[PDB]
From Swiss-Prot:
Disulfide bonds: C2-C30, C4-C19, C9-C29
Modified sites of kind ADP-ribosylarginine: R14, R24
Descriptive protein name: Neutrophil defensin 1
Residues where Phosphotyrosine is found: Y21
Lineage of the organism: Eukaryota, Metazoa, Chordata, Craniata, Vertebrata
């Protein structure tokens, strides 16, 4: 399962991209 997160992906997740919604950028993390 993947999630959008700020400020960064948590340890144990990998960043696969950037989410752009609710007015800000998020890390897309899986």
């Amino acid at each position: 399962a993947c999630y959008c997160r700020i400020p960064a992906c948590i340890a144990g997740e990998r960043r696969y991209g950037t989410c752009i919604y609710q007015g800000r950028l998020w890390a897309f993390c899986c």
